[PDB]
Structures are given as structure tokens and as C-alpha cells.
Design a protein around this ligand. Structure first.
Ligand SMILES: CC(=O)Nc1cccc(NC(N)=O)c1
Lengths: 412, 412
């Protein structure tokens, strides 16, 4: 029967730092990780900025010989995974290696690599395609390479559910442990879609902020002057662990994962429904899964992408799920500071949600100068808000009408 | 305790046919779907052949306008999914739509779309990238588009575990139903990687058969003259259904899904370990999950890719799991006929495992003219073998050492 699941380790690369504590300090100080992109010429592009990981050194983790074969999304995935496993204190042994798996996902995976090899194919010929093209680019190889490096023989898989990937990865990993398929899972996501096809593709859909002259003010969830999301890069990994297993080894427990919801919108390939009906179904699934009264929810880490339709749909969904309690909880979008890490969004945001529980503080929504029509909740505008938080919720929504909710609470 | 899961609907595109009965007819006849690839310049490539879907008419499923927005891999997934649902006779209503979900996956995703958009990007710049590039290319859009078309509001996600995708998708969909998270799931996978990037990428790793002179003899699992896998395209979808729900509406039940196994090799990025230790753990996990003794297994649909290391690893693994029963079971590779559909391999091979149960026949391993050293099992060489089949296994072993096993049993 269903076992309980706690968080014993976390790891991160974000536009705000090369680990969790450095990223969290930026979150709490309301710092932007958004800047003009330096790693390519974007003068032909309508969007020329985003949340880059600054000063990442893959040789802190892996030999340059192996790193050369791997897309940045995999490098980012392994970095955050190695941080999480070390943060857990867990020792992999012959006695437990079959009971430790990994579920690290990505929305797009190795787009930079596929682009670079596409360039080789068209400019030279197929003889110049890397022998490492396939294993160095496909989405399941964060899970693959992590298992090879650490000797993890448990369930080994990857989700790809677009901007919901991190939330789904973590939730389904928790189910694996809940149901006895594993005692430990490394789960989250990673993304590096800042290449020509990535910025060009989101640019073609007119989905991205074009505020090139003030990139730090571009991401403004629920602000009336918002004009699309800011594309960001990085990784979040969490060590999920069966409660008694964690207790038995004296693990430090950050928080308990008590609820997981999924639901499809079945509305539109890319647009959310204005009323937030799919997000509402998903949160209600997650709160019932947690055995909670919705009034127990203190803090929501919103999806909060800074799109016109997305932001308002989320207000509608929260008001519909929480009624008058929608005015008592605190909801913020850390995307105001990090931008939108796509498949890694749910992973870093799950970590920020856990850290809101540890430090009893709601992260700010920076740049919320003029809340839009109907955006009249506590959105923690401008400055972090210290407050009681026993129960934190993290929402993700994606293309395909795919929805995910994680519910975390303090563990005593 | 756990709900029982049955198969009520199947759909397929393969190199053997545009549906299940045409495909299955080819399988039992020992027909190859392998031929030189047409309408594509492979002059500079070391491999010029594979398993194409011949004569696919997407307008049987979608408007020309909707189909223009979607990669072939998505078109193929949608075709299989629509066939499977139609095959199941299921009626979606307001009363059940929240209990019907989708998990359709892909190993490699939208290479053909990425290729054509790269052409435009390098030649003319980013302003010629399609607006539908991103949603028309990402792996979760088969689940997304299917959920929107049929109004499915259940769990909506997509796996990507390389050549293990289809097996994992079906297995995890079955878990969703068993543990009460859904009553119906559409699950499987699709693949169209017969582009320059697919043929080039696998060709650069020298993973492909280069037997251009006799394409139909190229895929020869366990034969001493095999020289790598044959790249194939298509889709498999199954309607998975909770038994009481199936019985209540008078569903036709093909077979019961009784066991699902996952494992990681934690060995190498593309090669299995010689003794197939990971595949052996996976199969043991699957049988434990089914509450079955290895002696009860009658038929195994092998991974059987026709790679030197892969084929021998699977023989070691079966001999280890099945001891004195290893020769009594029949094991065949339908990849001898279909080639390797990568992420859709596990989906179409699940369907072939179910039909071996329905028709009491082991499909052949064609081209097994000279079994290699140690390949002395009943590999059903050349011709289909009528026999008793109560319990059928389907194995997938993928890049990153990710393993999947499905156990199907006769239902009456
Ligand atoms: C035709 C022949 O005799 N030899 C040969 C040798 C190397 C490369 C190729 N061409 C290729 N597309 O791989 C052909």
C-alpha cells in the first residue's frame, strides 16, 4: 500500500546561480538573471535576450573528453543531479542500487546539438555528423548518463511534456516510490533551447517578450504591460526518498511531497483556456491526493510565464479552486526573475517551493508595477514576504493542454 | 491491492501495412517491409534502405491544414491512436472523459521537421521558421492532439526512453489504471527518423546494417553475418482498460497486461553488458510483478535488433532468467521483418505479442540462416510456429541502458 515520499537533496543550475543556495539568494533579493544573449549573433531575431547559465564549468563534474560528446541540456541535467545526490548524503551500494532510479526530463532536449549537426549535414555532408549525435542529444540520456556514473539500476526513464516536464517528472518519480517500484529517485528536468531554432521557433509563434532594450523588466507575470515569456536555461534535480528509508539512514528531510495532480485541458495545442478549467481540475486532483482542505494552502509557486492568456487563466483557476481563501494565500511567479526554463521550469520551481517551506518566505513576483484586470490576489509584488507556510503548491501547464501540480508540506 | 488491466483496442502503422491485420498478415508470412528509401538523396550515406510506411494517407485522420502543422512522427502516432480507440468501441462522455488519458511517446521526435526548418534557417534566416515549428515538433503533441481531438481529460504525458519508449509508455499507462489514476489509457509510441539526421547519426556511430545489395536480408537477428540494425518508421497504440470497466460495456478483450518490468544497466551509453544482466533483472522484475514463475512463459518477442552485442546479450539474459525452461519457450525478433522502429518498436511488438496469444502462433525470426555462437534457443527461424501460448513477454533495451519488459497473458 501507498508509502510516503520526502525530499532529502536538491541541485540546480539557473540564470541566478550555479547551485541552489546561490540561486535562492537571488530569488529572495528579487535579482533578475535575464540579459542579452552573448553565445551567438541574434541581430536577425526579434528576441535577443534570455536567462543564460553564467560561468558554468562542466569540468567541475565531468572530464572535458566526455562533456564534448553531450548537449548542454545533458551537462546541465548531470550537474543538478550530482548536486542533488551529494546534498542527499545517500551512498549507492550493491544492497540498494536496484532500488534507486532516475527520471530527468526535457521539453526539447539537444536542440543546439541537432542544429550544429544539421549545419554539418547541409554545409558539408552526412560524413561530418558526430558519431555521438544520437546518445549526446536524445532526451533520455540525462537518466542514462546519471545511471552509468552513479551505478543506479532502478527505474530509468524520461518524460517530455513541454513546459510541464519538471513537475510531471518529480510527481511520477514520487508515484514510483509511493507504489514500491523504487525507494529513491533522482527527478527533475533540464533545458537549453537558446539556439537559432529555439529563439527562432518561439519567435515565429510570437510567444516571446521582445523587450530587447530592457531585458530585466521583460518577465512581468500579471503586469498589464507583459508581452510573452522569457526563454531561460538550466536544470533542477531532487532526491525523492521513501519516508522510512530516509528515517532509517537519518537523512535531513527538507519537506514531504504529499500531492500530485495531472489533467489534460483537451482545449488547444498551445493556448490555455481563459477560465483556467484544466489548471483547476489539476490542482483539485493534487489537493484531494494530499487529503487536504484547500484552506491549508499557504503559498503557490505559479506557472506565471508572463503571457497575456497564461497569467490570467491562472488567476481564474486559483479563485475557482480556493474561493475566498484565494485572498489569504500568497502566489508568486519566480519566472519574474529566472524567466521560463521550459521543461526545467517545474524542477527549479519545485525546489523554490521546498525552500519557501524551509525559510518560511514567499518569493517575490518582481516587475509587477501595474497588476492587470482581475489580478487582485496577494502576488507578492516587488519584495519577498516572510509568512507562515505549512503547505506550498507548484503549478506547471504546457503545450498539448498538459497540466501538473505538486503539493509539498513541512515535515516534523 | 491493484486493478486488472486488459487490451481492448490496437492500432498500427508499420513497414508491413497501414493497420494491425495487414501488418500481422506480413509477420506470419515472413514478409520483409525493408526496401531502398525513396524521394530522399542517400548518395553520400553508407545505408540507403530501411522500413518506410508505404502509402500513408493522413487525410483519413486529419484535414490537410492540421496535418501541415505536425511532424510525420506525430501524424503516425495520431493514426495508430485513432485506429486503437475506434478498435476499442469506447464512447467518450462527460461522465468518463476525466478517467481517459494518453501516454504516446517517441525516442527521437521531430527530426524531419527540425531538418526542413534548419534548411530555411541557414539559407534565409529565422523569419522563415514556421510558427508551428515548436508545437508541431515536440514529442508530447501526439498525447496533446489526441486529448484535444477526443476531449480526453485523464493523465496526459509522453515518455522518451529511446528504443524502450513504446514498452515504457504501455507499462506506465497500465500502472495509471492499476492504481486507480485512470480507467482508460491510449499508450504506445511513434517514430519517423528516416531523415538525413537519423540515417546520418546512426550511420556515423556505424550502428546500421550497410547490406545495400539485399535490403530484405539486412535485419538478421542472432545470425553470424548480422552487421547492425535496420532503421524503420511507424506507430503502435493500445487501448488499455480496467477489467470491470471493459466487462461493463461488453468490450472485446484481446489479452490481459499482468506484468511490467523496468531496470537500468548502468553500464554504457549505447552497448548492453555481454551477459545481459540488466535485461535479466528487468524480465525478473516483470515476472515478479505478474506473480509468475519463469517456467510459465511460452513466447518472448525479443528486442532482437540485429546488432552483434545486443543479440548475444539477450540470449545470455534469457538463459539466466529461464534456466532449464530457456529452450522450451519460443523467442523471435519481428525486427527480422519490420526493422527497428526505435521508440515505436515496443508499441508494435506489444501488439504482435497480443496477437501471438490470440492466434496461438510464434512469429518467425526470418534470415536466421546461421545461428551465431551460443544462439541455440528456439528462435523460430524462417517460418511462423503454431504452439501453446498462455504467457507472452515483450522486451525493449535502449540507449542509456534503459530496459522495459511487458507480460501479457491469455484472457478468458
Ligand atoms: C562504391 C564503392 O565501390 N566504394 C565506396 C567507398 C566509400 C564510400 C562510398 N560511398 C558511400 N556513399 O558510402 C563508396
Amino acid at each position: 500500500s501507498r508509502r510516503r515520499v520526502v525530499i532529502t537533496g536538491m541541485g540546480m543550475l539557473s540564470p541566478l546561480g550555479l547551485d541552489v543556495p546561490s540561486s535562492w539568494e537571488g530569488i529572495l533579493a528579487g535579482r533578475s538573471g535575464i540579459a542579452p544573449i552573448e553565445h551567438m549573433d541574434l541581430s536577425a531575431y526579434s528576441t535577443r535576450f534570455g536567462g543564460s547559465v553564467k560561468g558554468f564549468n562542466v569540468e567541475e563534474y565531468l572530464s572535458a573528453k566526455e562533456a564534448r560528446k553531450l548537449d548542454l541540456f545533458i551537462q546541465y541535467g548531470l550537474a543538478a543531479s550530482f548536486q542533488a545526490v551529494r546534498d542527499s548524503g545517500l551512498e549507492v551500494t550493491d544492497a540498494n542500487r536496484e532500488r534507486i532510479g532516475v527520471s530527468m526530463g526535457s521539453g526539447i532536449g539537444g536542440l543546439t546539438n541537432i542544429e550544429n549537426n544539421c549545419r554539418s549535414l547541409f554545409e558539408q555532408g552526412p560524413r561530418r555528423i558526430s558519431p555521438f549525435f544520437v546518445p549526446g542529444s536524445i532526451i533520455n540520456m540525462v537518466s542514462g548518463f546519471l545511471s552509468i556514473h552513479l551505478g543506479l539500476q532502478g527505474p530509468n526513464y524520461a518524460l517530455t511534456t513541454a513546459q510541464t516536464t519538471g513537475t510531471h517528472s518529480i510527481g511520477m518519480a514520487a508515484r514510483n516510490i509511493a507504489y514500491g517500484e523504487a525507494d529513491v529517485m533522482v527527478a527533475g528536468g533540464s533545458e537549453m533551447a537558446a539556439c537559432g531554432l529555439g529563439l527562432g521557433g518561439f519567435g515565429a509563434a510570437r510567444a516571446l517578450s521582445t523587450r530587447n532594450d530592457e531585458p530585466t523588466r521583460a518577465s512581468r507575470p500579471w503586469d498589464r504591460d507583459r508581452d510573452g515569456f522569457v526563454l531561460s536555461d538550466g536544470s533542477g534535480a531532487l532526491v525523492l526518498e521513501e519516508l522510512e528509508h530516509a528515517r532509517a539512514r537519518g537523512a535531513r528531510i527538507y519537506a514531504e511531497l504529499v500531492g500530485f495532480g495531472m489533467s489534460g485541458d483537451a482545449f488547444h495545442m498551445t493556448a490555455p483556456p481563459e477560465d483556467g478549467a484544466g489548471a483547476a481540475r489539476c490542482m483539485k486532483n493534487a489537493l484531494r491526493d494530499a487529503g487536504l482542505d484547500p484552506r491549508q494552502v499557504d503559498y503557490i509557486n505559479a506557472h506565471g510565464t508572463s503571457t497575456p492568456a497564461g497569467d490570467i487563466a491562472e488567476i481564474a483557476a486559483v479563485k475557482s479552486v480556493f474561493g475566498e481563501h484565494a485572498h489569504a494565500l500568497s502566489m508568486s511567479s519566480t519566472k519574474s526573475m529566472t524567466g521560463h526554463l521550459l521543461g526545467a521550469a517545474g524542477a527549479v520551481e519545485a525546489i523554490f517551493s521546498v525552500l519557501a517551506l524551509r525559510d518560511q518566505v514567499a518569493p517575490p513576483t518582481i516587475n509587477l508595477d501595474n497588476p492587470d484586470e482581475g489580478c487582485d490576489l496577494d502576488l507578492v509584488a516587488h519584495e519577498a514576504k516572510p509568512r507562515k507556510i505549512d503547505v506550498a503548491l507548484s503549478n506547471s501547464f504546457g503545450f498539448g493542454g498538459t497540466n501538473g501540480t505538486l503539493v509539498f508540506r513541512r515535515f516534523a
